[PDB]
Amino acid sequence: VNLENKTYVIMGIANKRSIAFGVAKVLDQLGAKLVFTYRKERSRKELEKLLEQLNQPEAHLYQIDVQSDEEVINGFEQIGKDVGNIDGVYHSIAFANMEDLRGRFSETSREGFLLAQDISSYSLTIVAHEAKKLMPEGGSIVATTYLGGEFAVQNYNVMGVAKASLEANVKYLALDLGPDNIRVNAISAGPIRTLSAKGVGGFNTILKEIEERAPLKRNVDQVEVGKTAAYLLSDLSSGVTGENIHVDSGFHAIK
Amino acid sequence: NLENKTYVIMGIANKRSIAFGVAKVLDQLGAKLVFTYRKERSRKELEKLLEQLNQPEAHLYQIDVQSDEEVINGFEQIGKDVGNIDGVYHSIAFANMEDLRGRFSETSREGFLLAQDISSYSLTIVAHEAKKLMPEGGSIVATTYLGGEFAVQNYNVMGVAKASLEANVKYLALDLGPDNIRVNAISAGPIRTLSAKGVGGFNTILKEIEERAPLKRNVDQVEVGKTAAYLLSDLSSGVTGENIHVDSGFHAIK
Amino acid sequence: NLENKTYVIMGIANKRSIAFGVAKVLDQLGAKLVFTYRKERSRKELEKLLEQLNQPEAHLYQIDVQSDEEVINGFEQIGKDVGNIDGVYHSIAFANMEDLRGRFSETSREGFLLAQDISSYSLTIVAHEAKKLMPEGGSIVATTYLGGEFAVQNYNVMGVAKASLEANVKYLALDLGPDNIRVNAISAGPIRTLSAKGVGGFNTILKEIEERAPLKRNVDQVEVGKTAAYLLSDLSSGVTGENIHVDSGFHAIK
Amino acid sequence: NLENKTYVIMGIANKRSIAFGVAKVLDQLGAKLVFTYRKERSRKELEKLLEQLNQPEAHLYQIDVQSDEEVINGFEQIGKDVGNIDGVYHSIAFANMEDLRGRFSETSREGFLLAQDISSYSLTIVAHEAKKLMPEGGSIVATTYLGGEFAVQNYNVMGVAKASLEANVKYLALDLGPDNIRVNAISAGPIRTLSAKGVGGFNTILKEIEERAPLKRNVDQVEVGKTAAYLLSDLSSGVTGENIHVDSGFHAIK
Numbered sequence A: 001v002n003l004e005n006k007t008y009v010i011m012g013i014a015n016k017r018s019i020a021f022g023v024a025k026v027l028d029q030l031g032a033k034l035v036f037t038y039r040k041e042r043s044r045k046e047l048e049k050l051l052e053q054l055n056q057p058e059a060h061l062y063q064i065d066v067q068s069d070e071e072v073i074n075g076f077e078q079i080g081k082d083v084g085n086i087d088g089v090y091h092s093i094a095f096a097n098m099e100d101l102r103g104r105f106s107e108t109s110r111e112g113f114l115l116a117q118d119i120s121s122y123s124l125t126i127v128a129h130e131a132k133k134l135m136p137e138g139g140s141i142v143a144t145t146y147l148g149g150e151f152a153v154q155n156y157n158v159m160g161v162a163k164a165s166l167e168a169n170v171k172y173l174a175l176d177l178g179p180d181n182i183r184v185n186a187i188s189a190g191p192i193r194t195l196s197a198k199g200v201g202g203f204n205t206i207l208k209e210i211e212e213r214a215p216l217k218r219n220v221d222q223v224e225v226g227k228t229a230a231y232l233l234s235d236l237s238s239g240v241t242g243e244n245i246h247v248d249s250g251f252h253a254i255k
Numbered sequence B, C, D: 001n002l003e004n005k006t007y008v009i010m011g012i013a014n015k016r017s018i019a020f021g022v023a024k025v026l027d028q029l030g031a032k033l034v035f036t037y038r039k040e041r042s043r044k045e046l047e048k049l050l051e052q053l054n055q056p057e058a059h060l061y062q063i064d065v066q067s068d069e070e071v072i073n074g075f076e077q078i079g080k081d082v083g084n085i086d087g088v089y090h091s092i093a094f095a096n097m098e099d100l101r102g103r104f105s106e107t108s109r110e111g112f113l114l115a116q117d118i119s120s121y122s123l124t125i126v127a128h129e130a131k132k133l134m135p136e137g138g139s140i141v142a143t144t145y146l147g148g149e150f151a152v153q154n155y156n157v158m159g160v161a162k163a164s165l166e167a168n169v170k171y172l173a174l175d176l177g178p179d180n181i182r183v184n185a186i187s188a189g190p191i192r193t194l195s196a197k198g199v200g201g202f203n204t205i206l207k208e209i210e211e212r213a214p215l216k217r218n219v220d221q222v223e224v225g226k227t228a229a230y231l232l233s234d235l236s237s238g239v240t241g242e243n244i245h246v247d248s249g250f251h252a253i254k
């Protein structure tokens, strides 16, 4: 991997522990130009300060709430006007109400169900549709998933079903965008301490189970997701699409 | 043999609905049945189809699964009229026609969330309400399609909604397992129904199964029903979180 | 109901064999049954077990599946004595105890190939011979474990033999489908059996299912039998190449 | 960058070997390579092809993986000549021609076990011997095919051997994980190689990939090499027991 002359859009950095920030450090070290999108004001503040550890000469920052069609549309439109054509997009975005990340899955409200679907799954579809305008001769889109999309897992609840959805959204976008030379793939990350993880029931007892039971007998970090992201986002992976690569110490393969 | 059993079948529109295949089999096997519908026309078709069944009473409730109120009051009224039930057959899905053909990447937010709402979320709330009527346990089965497991031409928004449904099944199985309520899926191969008439390329697929699947023939609604009868009965007492493919073997080949 | 159906059950050792849970269930449903066993310390023993069943007469045949001759002549004799059959329950596996614990990287070539031979290949030759007695179609079922789909501690060489078995089921299903012979697997949860004693860490696993599987309990031989009856009968007519987990929901969680 | 890395590549026969795609990519990235072969002809081809490589010296070892002693001694020799290694690329399978066409249920014992021994078991014993040369960890990658996961036409005995390999991969992963050795598979799409010339319907499968696979084209050996570089380097730290489909997306559609 050498990524000079490539440009990637990274969605979903909130702070220095975001998985997406591990992705940014890996592409930035490999020479990529990076463009960042955020929702909260605070996230933009964290980004402005995090850019200082990065080799990026210019901060390219865009507020995109992927709940709004408008913002996703105008956002990628503006990126294209500012930095020209891009080579792919790292998607690191999900959301559920607290209520819905513990207790009984059977008590999920309609509203918290669809909210999780909207932000964590649907958002990839609209991003794919808008980013593709910026990839007239091909590129790579990567989303972040979790083993809870493949098995029923304690507490993950409404997000499990949103990840199952995301993982199919990836396969369907791969089939659709493939003839355009646009590849689409998931990374299934193992548990990592991030802002978002602090809201998931039983996160610590899962962290520890990995260490004890996963083939590598250790947890992964954001940089390790970064390294697999670079592979997927680069020509090193040009034969690979509709795939989900587990970066989880091997925990997916055992029972 | 399901005498003294009571099942709620959701989703008969007409004589060709998969759920009517379920109904015939369970009726033949001695079960009391209760039916739920959305459209006026479906109650009409239902009243007529009961004349072919051995149900001596018509138990028909209008439940639109987009309304919590209707699901809640629906099942509550079922509880008052027939008492405790032994399982629920979920046979409900919907997507707008334009989201069943062409390019998936062009799917609207509203299109996507409508598919999810009716074809996946509806299972969670139905399970929640139906639970109240199974103090001793019971069985819930949903209807899915292989496009939930793989990207399949045209199926589009519905394939993402089935992937959600199939997951919804695993999560409900885990949640409701301690209450002795099994939750499973049947993944039916393609069958000519009213809804099937709205999916691009249905006919192509139907004939490819016939040519390519291990059994070299398509399945029908009665074969779905017979697998439902297994899953809804004590025959399948140790099975939950499972997706049985009733699809002539198509799922095992490539 | 299975009156006027005939099944070959392969792999009874003692009162605890999964195969015998299958037999009680098929016998209770009125099938005629034929039994195969490996050596004599099942023969005197099998004759005592059958007193429990309602088989009016014992049809018992020595087949060690390591020998083609015994598989071929065994099935030939069956056809001469009992006529055409409706299906086979395959309940047979073997590995050396030393390969069922410790480090999988340390498995011998001989131990690896023995587990393959007896645990997987045998289904292929049994299916070839059985087909001869199923001119109008039929049903073949093998017994597998979740350790064919995931790396699981200790199971080691048998895990790779089951992955092999589970593919064997898919390939047999495609091959024999046009002859209307369905081939499936049941993935049984842990059950206390003669063979289970030689598997490292078995009790640890059994206790864990009870703590963690959706149903919070273990399954038994009879629950395997009930799903076997489904798979062996016309109730499953549209299902082939399938692997049903009878395991309290354990496969669906992580 | 792979300077200061050494990888053993097993199974180049000629310029079209998948393993030679791997070697052109590793050699390009700075690695030192050691090659293993069976036939004298493969050695001849290896000496010819090394003129296209940056490798300053040839490191060729004859290892027929049917022999324990050749594997044990070959790797032992490799350690003595190059010292500790960073990884192995495994690109070895074999079945008799008669088992790559026609009816799977007609496979002989000897042909089934031959394919197992060469195509699956060999990875186990190669892992055990190579582990002696990886005290600080490393990476082992085997080459599989979609046919290990689904019943595919003609592939027959080798599909069951691939199921076996893919499980062999998971079990090696769990086993060698604590030693910091990662074990993974690449599922390559179909590519014109010497051994592909012996597989039934190989041409029609190639063309179907172009017509149906998401990228509407076939892959080549170098694309496998690229993914191999990733699996073999620190880029994939974290990844083990994984199967990456380098196949234009074909695994994910139906």
Ligand SMILES: NC(=O)c1ccc[n+]([C@@H]2O[C@H](COP(=O)([O-])OP(=O)(O)OC[C@H]3O[C@@H](n4cnc5c(N)ncnc54)[C@H](OP(=O)(O)O)[C@@H]3O)[C@@H](O)[C@H]2O)c1
Residues within 6 Å of the ligand: A011, A012, A013, A014, A015, A017, A018, A019, A020, A038, A039, A040, A041, A043, A064, A065, A066, A067, A091, A092, A093, A094, A095, A119, A144, A145, A146, A147, A188, A189, A190, A191, A192, A193, A194, A195, A196, A197
């Ligand atoms: N950490 C883990 O254990 C784990 C494991 C597997 C997969 N994942 C996945 O990894 C991804 C990244 O999450 P993380 O763990 O890195 O946590 P995180 O740092 O909290 O990142 C979550 C990001 O989602 C963004 N987001 C949520 N709603 C949004 C919206 N409506 N519009 C735009 N952005 C929105 C947030 O931005 P704002 O702060 O601006 O709202 C935030 O940047 C998620 O998909 C997650 O599900 C996490």
Ligand SMILES: NC(=O)c1ccc[n+]([C@@H]2O[C@H](COP(=O)([O-])OP(=O)(O)OC[C@H]3O[C@@H](n4cnc5c(N)ncnc54)[C@H](OP(=O)(O)O)[C@@H]3O)[C@@H](O)[C@H]2O)c1
Residues within 6 Å of the ligand: B010, B011, B012, B013, B014, B016, B017, B018, B019, B037, B038, B039, B040, B042, B063, B064, B065, B066, B090, B091, B092, B093, B094, B118, B143, B144, B145, B146, B187, B188, B189, B190, B191, B192, B193, B194, B195, B196
């Ligand atoms: N045919 C196939 O090839 C196939 C294959 C695999 C799985 N399936 C699945 O099998 C199930 C049954 O469909 P089908 O093919 O039998 O077609 P169908 O006869 O058209 O039945 C579909 C049913 O869905 C109901 N429905 C849709 N929206 C609803 C709502 N908001 N509230 C309550 N009911 C609603 C319809 O009721 P109303 O008419 O009253 O609106 C109708 O009874 C679906 O889940 C479908 O996805 C079908």
Ligand SMILES: NC(=O)c1ccc[n+]([C@@H]2O[C@H](COP(=O)([O-])OP(=O)(O)OC[C@H]3O[C@@H](n4cnc5c(N)ncnc54)[C@H](OP(=O)(O)O)[C@@H]3O)[C@@H](O)[C@H]2O)c1
Residues within 6 Å of the ligand: C010, C011, C012, C013, C014, C016, C017, C018, C019, C037, C038, C039, C042, C063, C064, C065, C066, C091, C092, C093, C094, C118, C143, C144, C145, C187, C188, C189, C190, C191, C192, C193, C194, C195, C196
């Ligand atoms: N017990 C469990 O928790 C569990 C779970 C899932 C799957 N399974 C599977 O269930 C099946 C039945 O095993 P089980 O647990 O019921 O134990 P079992 O009672 O000991 O049955 C295994 C049977 O295989 C027979 N067998 C071994 N090698 C043979 C050969 N070369 N030729 C003919 N027969 C041979 C044994 O016969 P002999 O008495 O003559 O040696 C015995 O009858 C096996 O496939 C096993 O892998 C078991």
Ligand SMILES: NC(=O)c1ccc[n+]([C@@H]2O[C@H](COP(=O)([O-])OP(=O)(O)OC[C@H]3O[C@@H](n4cnc5c(N)ncnc54)[C@H](OP(=O)(O)O)[C@@H]3O)[C@@H](O)[C@H]2O)c1
Residues within 6 Å of the ligand: D010, D011, D012, D013, D014, D016, D017, D018, D019, D037, D038, D039, D040, D042, D063, D064, D065, D066, D090, D091, D092, D093, D094, D118, D143, D144, D145, D146, D187, D188, D189, D190, D191, D192, D193, D194, D195, D196
């Ligand atoms: N080509 C494809 O479409 C495709 C697709 C998916 C996976 N694969 C897999 O890729 C791998 C490489 O195959 P290929 O297509 O590149 O064909 P290939 O060039 O013909 O290579 C096959 C290799 O296997 C070696 N081999 C067979 N038996 C052996 C033994 N007993 N000991 C040592 N080596 C032995 C051969 O060595 P000798 O010539 O010296 O005997 C040869 O180098 C295989 O695992 C194959 O199953 C291929």
Ligand SMILES: CCCCCc1ccc(Oc2ccccc2)c(O)c1
Residues within 6 Å of the ligand: A094, A095, A096, A101, A145, A146, A153, A154, A155, A156, A159, A190, A191, A192, A194, A196, A197, A198, A200, A201, A202, A203, A206
């Ligand atoms: C169930 C315990 C492990 C969960 C791992 C994990 C942690 C953070 C995750 O990110 C989330 C973002 C929004 C809502 C919920 C989660 C995640 O997806 C997955």
Ligand SMILES: CCCCCc1ccc(Oc2ccccc2)c(O)c1
Residues within 6 Å of the ligand: B093, B094, B095, B100, B144, B145, B147, B152, B153, B154, B155, B158, B189, B190, B191, B195, B196, B197, B198, B199, B200, B201, B202, B205
């Ligand atoms: C992709 C072609 C095969 C489609 C098979 C099939 C047919 C009908 C189906 O039922 C519905 C489809 C769309 C909306 C509502 C219900 C189905 O789920 C699956």
Ligand SMILES: CCCCCc1ccc(Oc2ccccc2)c(O)c1
Residues within 6 Å of the ligand: C093, C094, C095, C100, C144, C145, C147, C152, C153, C154, C155, C158, C189, C190, C191, C193, C195, C196, C199, C200, C201, C202, C205
């Ligand atoms: C891994 C611990 C759970 C074992 C469950 C289990 C028990 C018995 C089993 O049957 C065997 C038959 C012969 C040799 C070895 C095993 C099995 O397959 C699976």
Ligand SMILES: CCCCCc1ccc(Oc2ccccc2)c(O)c1
Residues within 6 Å of the ligand: D093, D094, D095, D100, D144, D145, D147, D152, D153, D154, D155, D158, D189, D190, D191, D193, D195, D196, D199, D200, D201, D202, D205
């Ligand atoms: C089924 C048609 C596609 C075959 C793809 C393919 C081609 C070559 C392959 O390599 C083989 C090596 C030895 C025996 C058999 C095959 C392969 O595994 C897979």
Ligand SMILES: N[C@@H](CCC(=O)O)C(=O)O
Residues within 6 Å of the ligand: A102, A200, A201, A202, A203, A204, A205
């Ligand atoms: N399960 C606790 C969290 C405790 C933990 O992290 O282990 C909760 O409901 O948040």
Ligand SMILES: N[C@@H](CCC(=O)O)C(=O)O
Residues within 6 Å of the ligand: D101, D199, D200, D201, D202, D203, D204
């Ligand atoms: N099916 C032929 C190969 C010719 C083709 O694929 O057209 C065979 O027996 O090898």
